[PDB]
Write a protein that binds this ligand. Structure first.
Ligand code: MG
Ligand code: MG
Length: 47
RNA sequence: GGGCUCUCGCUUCUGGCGCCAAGCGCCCGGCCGGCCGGGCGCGACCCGCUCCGGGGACAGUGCCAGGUGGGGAGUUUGAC
């Protein structure tokens, strides 16, 4: 029944091994000046 | 099988290649147990409040006060 051709082909997201995937980067975004403002406004209000 | 600490998370003989996902699970869409065409998530751990670091309540900026200042400006440099 099974085809010998269907090999399972894992990828190595190691250092240098293979190129890395497009994962979520919201924490490091260069936000516009209005957003960065209102956020660190609320933070000052806390501090 | 259990507690504790640290490390790692897989690359050092060579002038090479390396993108646009494999696989699995779970869903169902048309046709007729089989065919054609679709979707999500694991695979690629979870949560957060400042992009990362270094300084830092001092440099610094604004206003007064003393000083220094032919680098520069203005003027003078007697009479018989
Ligand atoms: Mg002067
Ligand atoms: Mg004059």
């Amino acid at each position: 029944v099974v085809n010998p051709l269907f090999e399972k082909r894992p990828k190595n997201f190691g250092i240098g091994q293979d190129i890395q995937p497009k994962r979520d980067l919201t924490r490091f975004v260069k936000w516009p000046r209005y957003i960065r403002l209102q956020r660190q406004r609320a933070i000052l209000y806390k501090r």
